Assembly symmetry: C3
Amino acid sequence: MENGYTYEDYKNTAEWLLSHTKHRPQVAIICGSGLGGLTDKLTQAQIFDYSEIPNFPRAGRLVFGFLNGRACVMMQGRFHMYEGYPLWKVTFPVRVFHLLGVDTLVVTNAAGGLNPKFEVGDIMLIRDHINLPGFSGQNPLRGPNDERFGDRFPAMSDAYDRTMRQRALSTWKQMGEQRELQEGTYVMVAGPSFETVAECRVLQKLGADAVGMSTVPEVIVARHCGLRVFGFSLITNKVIMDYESLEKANGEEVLAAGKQAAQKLEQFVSILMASIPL
Amino acid sequence: MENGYTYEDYKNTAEWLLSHTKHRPQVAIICGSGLGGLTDKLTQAQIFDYSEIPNFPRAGRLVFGFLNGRACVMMQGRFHMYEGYPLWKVTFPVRVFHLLGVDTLVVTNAAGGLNPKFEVGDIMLIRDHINLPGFSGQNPLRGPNDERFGDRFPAMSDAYDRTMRQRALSTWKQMGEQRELQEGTYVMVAGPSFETVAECRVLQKLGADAVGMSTVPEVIVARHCGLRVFGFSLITNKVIMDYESLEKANGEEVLAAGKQAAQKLEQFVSILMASIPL
Amino acid sequence: MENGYTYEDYKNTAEWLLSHTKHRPQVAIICGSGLGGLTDKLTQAQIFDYSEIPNFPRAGRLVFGFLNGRACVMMQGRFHMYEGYPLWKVTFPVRVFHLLGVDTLVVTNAAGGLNPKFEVGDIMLIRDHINLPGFSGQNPLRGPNDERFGDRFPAMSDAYDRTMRQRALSTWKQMGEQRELQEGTYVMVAGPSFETVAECRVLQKLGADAVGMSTVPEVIVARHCGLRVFGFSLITNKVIMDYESLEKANGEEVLAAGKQAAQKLEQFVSILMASIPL
Ligand SMILES: O=c1[nH]cnc2c([C@@H]3N[C@H](CO)[C@@H](O)[C@H]3O)c[nH]c12
Ligand SMILES: O=c1[nH]cnc2c([C@@H]3N[C@H](CO)[C@@H](O)[C@H]3O)c[nH]c12
Ligand SMILES: O=c1[nH]cnc2c([C@@H]3N[C@H](CO)[C@@H](O)[C@H]3O)c[nH]c12
């Protein structure tokens, strides 16, 4: 295997962007889908379709602008391993962002609650991840390493910025809420099918608190090239963890688990901006 | 990655079959190898070699006929990830079956007993699975989804039909047997080499009861497109679970673990037919 | 998928080698990198670069010679899944070795200690492995099997020769050392990034004692074709197993964890030679 992109392809995507928008983003935000009407909060919103973007994998848009005093770039729609993309395509935008000048990555996603304490609607702050595809070989850094981005063997034990995590628990308290900010381990599985009961039990045993099909690869790539990362999971569903229970996970409840729980998340992210140091 | 087949290739395999046999199967059966002399029980047996079959991966035969009052199609020999097939080839026949008109899938396989209660010879009824290749990306649905088959994000928490499971425990009692029908979680690993002792201990800890190298992908594809699924593992070997024990798993004992334990299985499947609703 | 090499490519690499060196090796040694200045201990050292070697994947050298009374072949630098090589390239030299006449494989590697009893510097003798890439499909034997090498379904429950393990604990006692020879399960993960804390906790729970990114595939291929295998991990780092700890795994401490701990290892291997039966 080999990454299709050369250092230069990245570099030429970045330049193209640098020249087609006067915005100079500092914070990249990678939202779910449902969990990002977050586009209206921006101001001076400039949109590019992925389709116009030299090299951009493949209705997918890059929106540049200003969230609450920070210059942002928001990916609206992301790529997934389950769509068939190799990981070096899934995480191509991350490297592009670094070269645009960005120094922080915020990632959000929807995920099934594995911890029996979580409730549909909860926001879980990501403290750590379990990269199960990565154990087998599906790590987005597989291949020759390019030292212009970062090291051969980057560390992930501190992927999720301790400072931003503290500031996120501050901010949340900064509005004394009906539920608290949750915290835990996000496990990535490839999907696109949902877990069996036995699989759920496997993931609870591994120590995971939430489960989804994304995020981890962008986080690894982000950290490889020196960005500060933090993120959240909107728990959209409690994963079925025993056999009598006749109820099921669907793409419908994940999507339709926008509502006040998703608006909550938008506003939370938008306030966070103020805790990101210039 | 991308599935090599288009909706049309399936469709043209099905039509070719619809026109070359007057049989109209309702139940697809996917047997092991050793565990399916089950071909003689059929009547009005019409055979096609895979080799004559427009598109069929690659001595492999589709046998059409009548098991105990049901119109069947029996795959004789299957494909495996360990032979090098991508999963979209392994599970191609499943989609073909759906379009032939089939509404039920019975899958059987040979597997090592992980549960220390099992004994060589036991039939384990499949209650659930742990799809370890699927955690990393080897899910046969990886790629663009085709809604003519089914949803983007199908559920697997109920893959193994509760009704058929109940009817299977009925039927077994319907002949008050020397051992009981076993029940549990089948875990798929890719192979083709057998597990170490430490690996066995891993799989026991995950909650698995039996282990093999097949089945799970056909089950996921079956469920993706609305079939009713049930299956069995003939436990052909107790997997070596500690270090003094000098005895070893071989392809010889799996094969030669036909005998009265495999005939038992044939007859069991053949009676089951009567519990499959028209 | 398919292995790029045919039985003949192996065969022609071997012959080329058989004819370009009068050495006839019996023991293949596959060292780390840092953990093999072991080249000077050899005598009658003949070097080939990988680059001159018909078919050899891709500064990489095969060194032929004599360790302590045994005819050796030492791979200096190896291939890794994380560099992008498929496993059938990573393990190509192993098959070549078998055809050179070799009957034993010694493998060594650097690995993070998962067992809280290990200490940086410790040598762990490999008693077993957990091949996590192999669970998902990344097994170097994936594809049609070639019976000239070995069986379709080889066993790995005895991969790590019990005799050589006993002789290794003898030999170590044969110099009554400040720490003892450690022993345990090596788990392979693909890398190239290092584990999170949560991942470490996963691997401790699976029963693993050390973790690295190599070895397992060569061992599986070695055993597939009948070689005797034994190996070691030099524990170069204690893997970070809880969150307050601010210290991190780096490629620098792994490399610079040569020193007296690596010389110890060289000398240990060099004495071992005397326990390998002719
Ligand atoms: O219970 C779950 N298991 C795995 N993934 C998801 C998700 C996320 N939502 C999407 C599927 O609805 C998918 O893109 C995935 O990342 C929500 N709930 C679950
Ligand atoms: O102990 C085992 N581990 C993994 N697979 C199998 C099998 C099944 N039998 C075949 C190998 O003998 C293979 O196709 C696999 O699906 C029997 N026993 C075991
Ligand atoms: O803590 C660890 N986790 C995973 N691999 C390694 C290694 C081994 N060392 C190399 C990276 O420094 C790499 O080739 C890997 O096989 C040392 N320590 C660790």
